[PDB]
Each structure stands twice: as structure tokens, then as C-alpha cells.
């Protein structure tokens, strides 16, 4: 599967000027665009080589979408403060994520469009992309508003049409990096804690995309209980890192194997210290 995903954040700051608006876009786990209303020169900026060579009119068009979106999100922040009757001195956050997914088919699989206010679910297009789900009475005002203007018809048109056309174009132009998987580079470390206890750590570095499964097994059966996983983290170069740790009785290390599963591995990996 492949996906294109956008993330919008808008934050009010009463007495410090108009709310800041930040947008980022991704294809799979690769960022390709950013906009920041607070930037020195606010405009759409490339973050990947396969959109760098898009022309100045493409960039001019994207920049005007963001400036227009930033203005609309400042209005929504002021409306939302009224719906909840909040003080005008507090800072508030409005977030939106939307995107489209291609199936193994290469054809459209799903789309989505969801909103949050102050970190909590606010309103969302349902999976059919035809109806809304409102989290509370304030969001019902927005739902009544949006369905009166057939907003869902407009969003479905983009998610099922324009979004897939861009994603396909991006996948073609950036195929050297977007349609390759880089397998994890692995190793196992051991740390004795006590006479009765030791810890095994299984490392995965430099892999793309970010999805990976690290499982510790004892005598071949998976032991998800005693294992400790870190959050997958960015290396900063476009690849990702992760480790899984298990506490084992000292002396029994050879009965433990780490199972690594990644799109870049032709067959799963069995690692032993």
C-alpha cells in the first residue's frame, strides 16, 4: 500500500497577533512539503527531491492554498472559542489530518479527514466519506454547518480523485526512493544486571518504511509480555530506528531469539545473541 497524508496545526496566541498555521505533507513516511505562516518568508517549501523539480507555478499554487487555509483556520479557532464560550486570553489548538491510501491494487482503497480541538477528537468524515461524526454538541454546530454546504461532497471529490492523482504522480517521479524498501541493519546486545537477571536488546537501524515488528521468542514461542519496545524514531536521514528489550534469567540467553519482520526482508530474521 501507499499513502499521501497532510497534517495541519493552528495555534491561537491572544495578544501576540494572529494564530500560527503549520502544514506538512507526506508520501508514506517521507515528508515532501512544509508551510509555516510564521516563517521568514511564508510559502510552500520542498522537503524531498521529487517535488523540487516541480515548476514555480506548482509551488505558487500550493503556497496560495496554504495562505487561504491559514486564514480559514484562524476563523475556525475564533468560532470554536465561541461555541465553547472560552475566555479570550487562552491559547487553543486546531489540528486536521487527511489523506488517501492506495491498495495493493494500486487503486484507491480509503481516504480520511479528521479534526481535533485542544488535542481531543472534534469532527471526522466517516469511512464512507459521505457522513460526519461529531464528538459533542459544539461539533454538531459544525456538522449542521458543513452538511448544509455539502462539504463532504467537496472533500470526497478530492480524497477519491485529486489526492490519488497526485500520489500516483509522486510515486512515479520519486520511484527511486519511494518504491524501494531498505531493510533494517540489526544486532543484539547483552547486559548483565544481577546473578539472576540479564537483559537482551535487539536493534534495528536504517530501515524504511517505518513499520517494523521486533518480537522476542523463548524456545521459539513469541514472548510479547516481558519485552520492552521503544517508540520507532527517525534517524534524521529518512530512515528509522527501533529496539526491543527482554529480561531473561541469567544463563538462559541462548533460548531467546529475536524475530525481525520488515518489508525489506525477503524472509523474516531470527537473531540470537
Amino acid at each position: 500500500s501507499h499513502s499521501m497524508r497532510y497534517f495541519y496545526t493552528a495555534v491561537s496566541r491572544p495578544g501576540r497577533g494572529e494564530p500560527r498555521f503549520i502544514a506538512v505533507g507526506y508520501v508514506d513516511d517521507t515528508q515532501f512539503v512544509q508551510f509555516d505562516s510564521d516563517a521568514a518568508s511564508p510559502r510552500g517549501e520542498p522537503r524531498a527531491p521529487w517535488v523540487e523539480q516541480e515548476g514555480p507555478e506548482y509551488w505558487d499554487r500550493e503556497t496560495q492554498k496554504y495562505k487561504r487555509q491559514a486564514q480559514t483556520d484562524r476563523v475556525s479557532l475564533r468560532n470554536l472559542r465561541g461555541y465553547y464560550n472560552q475566555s479570550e486570553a487562552g491559547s487553543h489548538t486546531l489540528q486536521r489530518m487527511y489523506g488517501c491510501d492506495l491498495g495493493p491494487d494500486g487503486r484507491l482503497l480509503r481516504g480520511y479527514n479528521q479534526f481535533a480541538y485542544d488535542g481531543k477528537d472534534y469532527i471526522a468524515l466517516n469511512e464512507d466519506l459521505r457522513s460526519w461524526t461529531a464528538a459533542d454538541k459544539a461539533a454538531q454546530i459544525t456538522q449542521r454547518k458543513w452538511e448544509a454546504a455539502r462539504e463532504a461532497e467537496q472533500r470526497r471529490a478530492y480524497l477519491e480523485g485529486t489526492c490519488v492523482e497526485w500520489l500516483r504522480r509522486y510515486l512515479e517521479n520519486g520511484k527511486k526512493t519511494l518504491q524501494r524498501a531498505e531493510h533494517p541493519k540489526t544486532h543484539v546486545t547483552h547486559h548483565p544486571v544481577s546473578d539472576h537477571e540479564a537483559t537482551l536488546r535487539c536493534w534495528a537501524l536504517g530501515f524504511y518504511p517505518a513499520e517494523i515488528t521486533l518480537t522476542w521468542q523463548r524456545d521459539g514461542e513469541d514472548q510479547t509480555q516481558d519485552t520492552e519496545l521503544v517508540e520507532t524514531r527517525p534517524a534524521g536521514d529518512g530512515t528509522f530506528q527501533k529496539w526491543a528489550a527482554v529480561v531473561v534469567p541469567s544463563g538462559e540467553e541462548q533460548r531467546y531469539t529475536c524475530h525481525v519482520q520488515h518489508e525489506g526482508l525477503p524472509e523474516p530474521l531470527t537473531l540470537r545473541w
Partner: peptide, 9 residues
């Protein structure tokens, strides 16, 4: 390619 701008909340 970003979505067009719709209605405020």
C-alpha cells in the same frame, strides 16, 4: 497536492 479550502468550523 493539498486539498482546496472549504468552510470554517
Amino acid at each position: 497536492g493539498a486539498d482546496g479550502v472549504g468552510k470554517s468550523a
